[PDB]
Design a protein around this nucleic acid. Sequence first.
RNA 1: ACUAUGGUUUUUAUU
RNA 2: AGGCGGCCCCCUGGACGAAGACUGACGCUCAGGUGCGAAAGCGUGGGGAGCAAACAGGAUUAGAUACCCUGGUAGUCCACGCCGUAAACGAUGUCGACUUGGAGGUUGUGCCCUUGAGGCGUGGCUUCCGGAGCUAACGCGUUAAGUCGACCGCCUGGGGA
Lengths: 117, 150, 51, 55
Amino acid sequence: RKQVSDGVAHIHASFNNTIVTITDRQGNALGWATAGGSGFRGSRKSTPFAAQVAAERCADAVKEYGIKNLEVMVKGPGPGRESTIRALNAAGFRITNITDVTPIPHNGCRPPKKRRV
Amino acid sequence: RRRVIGQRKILPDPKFGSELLAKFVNILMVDGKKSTAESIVYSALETLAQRSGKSELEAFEVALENVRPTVEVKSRRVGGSTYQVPVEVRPVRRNALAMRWIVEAARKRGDKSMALRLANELSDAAENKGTAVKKREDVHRMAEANKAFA
Amino acid sequence: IKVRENEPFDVALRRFKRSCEKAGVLAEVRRREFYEKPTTERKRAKASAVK
Amino acid sequence: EIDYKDIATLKNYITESGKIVPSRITGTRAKYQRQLARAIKRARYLSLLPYTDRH
RNA sequence: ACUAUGGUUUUUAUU
RNA sequence: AGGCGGCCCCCUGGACGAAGACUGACGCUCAGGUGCGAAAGCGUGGGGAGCAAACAGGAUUAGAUACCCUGGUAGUCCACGCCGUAAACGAUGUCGACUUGGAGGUUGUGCCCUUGAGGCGUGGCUUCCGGAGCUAACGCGUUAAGUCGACCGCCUGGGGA
């Protein structure tokens, strides 16, 4: 409802899935998709490909909403957290930047115990 | 060194201005007889009036548009960690990777009529599916392999 | 090595690879060289965070 | 182990979400952390620090 | 860490 | 010992710092006996989310009653009692007095204008490396597989058992 051709993309990558949400600065979440909704399972669902096609299916779900530029905010410790630039290039979008929004590593259950030092 | 390639790079056709034609007169034409090979050279545009393809003046441009590869898979073995990574093919080599196809059921066909035979494959390969793309759909299969890393 | 990432950073720390085995093993453990350099000189090295 | 009523020190080890900050990113020792968590638990039960932001 | 299959199961040899 | 982790309050067997004063051999082992569960089994009434023998199915495959997957009982949980199980492996019976260096962790203690997740000595515990001695070998290595001194349990080719 602001018609600015401009918005934000929020990514969250886990050790199974990846979430992609596209939102307007007025708080209207224009569309969302996951690697799970794309029919994938297990380690393949966690891939940068499975995240990229979830973003390409989401760019295909905002294709009547009038938007052309996005700024990216990346979150989660999993693989496939920054392949969305290749989905923007597939859909013809312009990009501002890719910003990491990692929160403080609270809890800290089962990090890799191999070695140390 | 020895390079094992002619690396051509030719001149375009002297009455069509196109480089595509100056490479495609070489298909199903043998021992370089291109000035007496009247039974095949250019004649696929004259026999398309008996085969299912459309707009003969672009029928090779559209057929080539629908068969070319986009990637090649190249291992990077370090331990491994075998890295079966796809990378995109370069803007000339994308055509050379398609040079051997489209004739594999025409050589090798009987019933003479070479020009009508080439117009049959010029209609069948342009479907982006099944024939002429069996190795293109095998690159698509080899592009599934890097997903094993997760 | 190998070992999968659990904390996201775009730049490496050189903390786990070739620093770390090649070299990093069987050259400092248990009284090798000693004198003062692998222990006592490090006990005299000041740190503004633990360590 | 000595205090739980003066919260100026305890706010140095929790976020604006009230969650506890790991010793591995504050230059703090773990044998302190184990008891700074007890001081935070004492001050939560005193209702002067938050338990969870639900709430 | 870097991409699935599961069964049959030698006898004389050596004097 | 089997084992034992949110905070908070009581009660409790051992271990240790340290200045005085008091016993006066009061010490040790142990047949028989007796104390005690990680587990599952006995069972009456409650509980049922994780996980799961049993079990309905999916399958699987040439087949399957199994691997894999959807659901899932006994059981793990609670009160109160029986059972006494195991690799109950710290591979080292319970007790006494000796031997030989190094380095870490953990807890006192003396002194640091505390490089100080402490430092340099000295008491307790303990782990890795390593010497005498002992071993076929692993190695054990002062908390010993060493040195013998007390007392107990048990043995004498393998299978059968």
